[PDB]
Design a binder for this molecule. Structure first.
Ligand SMILES: CCCCCCCC/C=C\CCCCCCCC(=O)O[C@H](COC(=O)CCCCCCCCCCCCCCC)COP(=O)([O-])OCC[N+](C)(C)C
Ligand SMILES: CCCCCCCC/C=C\CCCCCCCC(=O)O[C@H](COC(=O)CCCCCCCCCCCCCCC)COP(=O)([O-])OCC[N+](C)(C)C
Ligand SMILES: CCCCCCCC/C=C\CCCCCCCC(=O)O[C@H](COC(=O)CCCCCCCCCCCCCCC)COP(=O)(O)OCCN
Ligand SMILES: CCCCCCCC/C=C\CCCCCCCC(=O)O[C@H](COC(=O)CCCCCCCCCCCCCCC)COP(=O)(O)OCCN
Ligand SMILES: CCCCCCCC/C=C\CCCCCCCC(=O)O[C@H](COC(=O)CCCCCCCCCCCCCCC)COP(=O)(O)OCCN
Ligand SMILES: CCCCCCCC/C=C\CCCCCCCC(=O)O[C@H](COC(=O)CCCCCCCCCCCCCCC)COP(=O)(O)OCCN
Ligand SMILES: CCCCCCCC/C=C\CCCCCCCC(=O)O[C@H](COC(=O)CCCCCCCCCCCCCCC)COP(=O)(O)OCCN
Ligand SMILES: CCCCCCCC/C=C\CCCCCCCC(=O)O[C@H](COC(=O)CCCCCCCCCCCCCCC)COP(=O)(O)OCCN
Ligand SMILES: CCCCCCCC/C=C\CCCCCCCC(=O)O[C@H](COC(=O)CCCCCCCCCCCCCCC)COP(=O)(O)OCCN
Ligand SMILES: CCCCCCCC/C=C\CCCCCCCC(=O)O[C@H](COC(=O)CCCCCCCCCCCCCCC)COP(=O)(O)OCCN
Ligand SMILES: CCCCCCCC/C=C\CCCCCCCC(=O)O[C@H](COC(=O)CCCCCCCCCCCCCCC)COP(=O)(O)OCCN
Ligand SMILES: *C(=S)NCc1ccccc1
Lengths: 440, 270
């Protein structure tokens, strides 16, 4: 495709082609009612090609030029103002409403559980009428509505997850967000069920704890779609996967030190069991060694069996785990964060264009014809609509030697070709030249 | 233009609060309000006084690195809010019978204090377990190991990696930024002074004696000691020379074709 070939091969001509799409009104009247017009005729195919996979029978994607510019890493073209206004129009068309609906359903699930936790003392069995101790009134109207909201949100989450099962067709097995949602909705069901079926308070609060943990832990995954927080979520992902790869070294090293301290320091209560000794060394990992309480004061009271071996184990633990292993994790984290911030400005716009090109494949085509626009008119003097809340929302959440030497090499190759032709002409001159009075 | 400016806000807080700390010479004020204002004022005076070190040449680089790290820490705050609220409400449900986790707000403040690594394992987890005072002990220890992995290991190393990257980015351009701040200071200050003072104070030439020290050797010298102190262009020149070379070679090729066009061929034809 010639536009995609221009993006692949000569992007500095695609820049000029996009410069013809930008229009202006008057250079002197730039403050008084001034406008600029953006035309998006070269950035996408017509809509009747894109969603017509059976009947047009040609491969198409929505946002053709943007996907071609992302696959070829042409970031100076993604930062062109025509492309910026194209994504901004595409977000104001259907991306904002779809994302706020997707966030609003989950937040409707999220808020009543936190209200219900911070308004009820844990450990006590509570029911639609109140809290069983006698019954506690004066909050039952709030408690009943919050339990109904959590119950309805959990069953609609089941229906949405079953729809994603019967649509995704077994690609959803190795996916973390599905597993987190299964845990959230099952556990939030069990926390609320005493309005139907009586449950002991121990099981009820044991489920409430897990649910209130995983709701807010899952709610970090919805910050990845925004432009400010997605880079923190992807750096946290990279550091956490790097920490997962290194876990067997933790297991072996920690099990060595834990069983050694279990044999050495057996008479003390933190090292009574082997499992408690393992958990204690895991807590000592950061540097909370407890030298005076566990090593010195038993030594001065003659309560250490094997004291020399115990202090040698202490200095060996202090050298290996809090010095060496923690600095290893710090060096790995510094390297990974530098690697991620090397490619941040491309990754942001790539996530946005992937979000829109994934969302557009599911919407119906009449809605696409209704909502899209071919041109946008921008007034720099006039602010955008919805100045009260939407402006604060957009402030808070939204925002070369190689090619030179390659051109050098092309010019030098043209130079040596011309010089070869010229050398052939000079040999032809000497072949046809007339030599009189210079022979012999 | 002064609305989105931090130094104006700090000065409003400083001067209002220092007024209220002193007003018992005019109007009698209870001692509680007076010392409540004195605390805020003595905090913000010395906290504001860092902003005046930015004009000097030695300390301005530390003030701008501290600015960069602090803005980077401000951008990441919603991750702190969500993660800390998750762990705080989880510990509030789990460890409810203990005094640091009696309220949800106290539980949130306690997890914020546990952030750095002051976990209090023996006092809050072990010794209640040995006295059978933990409800849900397995879930409690699982929450403990999950908290130890997420917040002091992962999140703190993330902040360290971001700080290392930002400080490297700032020290990449330090020597230009120092002189740029000095020349911006002088070119901003000169627009407000009157013109007769400018004609009075400026000089066209300066004479420097390397053998003779500058005037005010006692205090001003110690003050000036304490507070004051390429491949791309080469390949571009390469490209210009090569372009001139190919232009000359084209002219020469045209001359050689003209030679063959006008040449006289006798006894070499056919
Ligand atoms: C003695 C003991 C020693 C042990 C040492 C062990 C050391 C080992 C340590 C850690 C290994 C375990 C880490 C688990 C998840 C890592 C993978 C992951 O999320 O990356 C990716 C996202 O990453 C993110 O950005 C998400 C980050 C937040 C998720 C938090 C949930 C975890 C809660 C669990 C707590 C359970 C505790 C319960 C207790 C009650 C997801 O993977 P992906 O498919 O690439 O991306 C798809 C993303 N979309 C498209 C779906 C959006
Ligand atoms: C559970 C809780 C969890 C919460 C997590 C929260 C995590 C979030 C953390 C932090 C976010 C808040 C940071 C506030 C300021 C950051 C912006 C800033 O100063 O940068 C710039 C300078 O930067 C500097 O170099 C100045 C540095 C010193 C200023 C210190 C004053 C702060 C005192 C507040 C303490 C209040 C406490 C009161 C209590 C009594 C100023 O901005 P600028 O316009 O670019 O430059 C103009 C500079 N000139 C020209 C004016 C000179
Ligand atoms: C997010 C938006 C939700 C905000 C609505 C919360 C109002 C509930 C509230 O204040 O109840 C009061 C308690 O407030 C809370 O602590 C609710 C905490 C939920 C915060 C989650 C966000 C009850 O006090 P009283 O009966 O007036 O005496
Ligand atoms: C307790 C532990 C529960 C945590 C399990 C969740 C881990 C899932 C991450 C995973 O498998 O990612 C894969 C990484 O695999 C690993 O190295 C995980 C190692 C864990 C082994 C511990 C036994 C591939 O990453 P990606 O899909 O490119 O992103
Ligand atoms: C390197 C990986 C090897 C780690 C596996 C060690 C687990 C052995 C273990 O704890 O065995 C028994 C199992 O204890 C438990 O409750 C679960 C143990 C799982 C620990 C695995 C964590 C390693 C990382 C402990 O028995 P006891 O407390 O001495 O009382 C017995 C009364 N009849
Ligand atoms: C890579 C090198 C690893 C070396 C492995 C050996 C263990 C590491 C120990 C280092 C300690 C450094 C200096 C300590 C010198 C103290 C001398 C002394 O009199 O203490 C004595 C030192 O105790 C010991 O550590 C002796 C070890 C006995 C184990 C016997 C068999 C192990 C030898 C391995 C043979 C392999 C040789 C291959 C080469 C006993 O004092 P106590 O423990 O206070 O008992 C009194 C009970 N109330
Ligand atoms: C390696 C360099 C080792 C340097 C010095 C080790 C000298 C210790 C051996 C004998 C000390 C006897 C003893 O009970 O020491 C007591 C305990 O001190 C110790 O045993 C310290 C042992 C430190 C061993 C360090 C070697 C481990 C190095 C591994 C690093 C691998 C990474 C206290 O001494 P005191 O208060 O003077 O008591 C006098 C009353 N009799
Ligand atoms: C308690 C909190 C009070 C702290 C408020 C002071 C923050 C002002 C910094 C600011 O707005 O800078 C702007 C940065 O905006 C942010 O990301 C601040 C995020 C804080 C959100 C918390 C709610 C632009 O920086 P600059 O003007 O280029 O230098
Ligand atoms: C993620 C962001 C959500 C954070 C909002 C949670 C605040 C809920 C809260 O503390 O509600 C009530 C408000 O408590 C306060 O004094 C201020 C709470 C503000 C906390 C916000 C900090 C989050 C970061 C606590 O009620 P109580 O102590 O149980 O006693 C009630 C007696 N009638
Ligand atoms: C990403 C993976 C997250 C998994 C989420 C589940 C919670 C994480 C827990 C991990 C623990 C690892 C090994 C522990 C095994 C111990 C077995 C055992 O006998 O303990 C038992 C373990 O307790 C539990 O944690 C059971 C949890 C009950 C909640 C029931 C409903 C939640 C299940 C979710 C279903 C979703 C499935 C989707 C796939 C009870 O002992 P206790 O708490 O000491 O109570 C005695 C009171 N005096
Ligand atoms: C993941 C690998 C998990 C490894 C081992 C878990 C084995 C614990 C289950 C059953 C232990 C029963 C128990 O009460 O343990 C007691 C408490 O220990 C625990 O429950 C430790 C639980 C650790 C769970 C770790 C899994 C969380 C991983 C999430 C990381 C995500 C990042 C003490 O044991 P004991 O002194 O041997 O008592 C014996 C007298 N009956
Ligand atoms: C191939 S013909 N390029 C795609 C395209 C995009 C916009 C307008 C025309 C063509």
């Amino acid at each position: 495709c010639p536009i995609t070939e221009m993006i692949e091969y000569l992007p500095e001509c695609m820049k000029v082609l996009l410069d013809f799409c930008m229009l202006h009104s008057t250079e002197d009247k730039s403050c008084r009612d001034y406008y600029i017009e953006y035309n998006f005729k070269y950035l996408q195919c017509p809509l009747e090609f894109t969603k017509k996979t059976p009947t047009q029978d040609v491969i198409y994607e929505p946002l053709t030029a943007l996907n071609a510019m992302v696959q070829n890493n042409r970031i100076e073209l993604l930062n062109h103002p025509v492309c910026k206004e194209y994504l901004l129009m595409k977000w104001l068309a259907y991306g904002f409403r779809a994302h706020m609906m997707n966030l609003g359903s989950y937040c409707l699930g999220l808020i009543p559980m936190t209200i219900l936790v911070v308004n009820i003392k844990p450990g006590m069995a509570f029911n639609s009428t109140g809290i069983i101790n006698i019954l506690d009134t004066t909050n039952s109207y709030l408690i009943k509505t919050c339990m109904i909201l959590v119950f309805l949100s959990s069953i609609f989450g089941y229906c949405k997850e079953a729809g994603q099962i019967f649509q995704q067709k077994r690609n959803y097995f190795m996916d973390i967000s599905n597993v987190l949602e299964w845990i959230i909705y099952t556990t939030g069901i069990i926390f609320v069920l005493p309005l139907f079926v009586e449950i002991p308070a121990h099981l009820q609060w044991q489920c409430g704890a897990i649910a209130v943990y995983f709701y807010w832990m899952n709610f970090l995954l919805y910050l990845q779609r925004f432009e400010n927080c997605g880079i923190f979520i992807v750096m946290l992902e990279v550091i956490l996967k790097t920490l997962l790869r290194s876990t067997v070294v933790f297991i072996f090293l920690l099990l060595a030190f834990g069983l050694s301290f279990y044999i050495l320091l057996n008479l003390q209560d933190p090292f009574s069991s082997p499992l408690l000794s393992i958990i204690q060394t895991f807590s000592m990992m950061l540097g909370d060694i407890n030298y005076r309480e566990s090593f010195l004061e038993p030594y001065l009271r003659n309560e250490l069996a094997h004291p020399v071996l115990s202090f040698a184990q202490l200095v060996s633990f202090t050298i290996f785990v809090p010095i060496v292993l923690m600095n290893l994790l710090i060096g790995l984290a510094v390297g990974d964060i530098a690697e991620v911030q090397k490619h941040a400005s491309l990754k942001r716009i790539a996530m946005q264009v992937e979000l829109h090109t994934s969302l557009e494949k599911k919407l119906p085509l009449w809605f696409l014809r209704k909502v899209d626009q071919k041109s946008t008119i921008v007034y720099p003097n006039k602010p955008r609509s919805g100045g009260m809340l939407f402006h604060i929302f957009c402030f808070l959440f939204c925002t070369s030697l190689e090619m030179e030497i390659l051109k050098q090499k092309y010019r030098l190759k043209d130079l040596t070709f011309l010089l070869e032709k010229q050398h052939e002409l000079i040999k032809l001159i000497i072949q046809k030249m007339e030599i009189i009075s210079e022979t012999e």
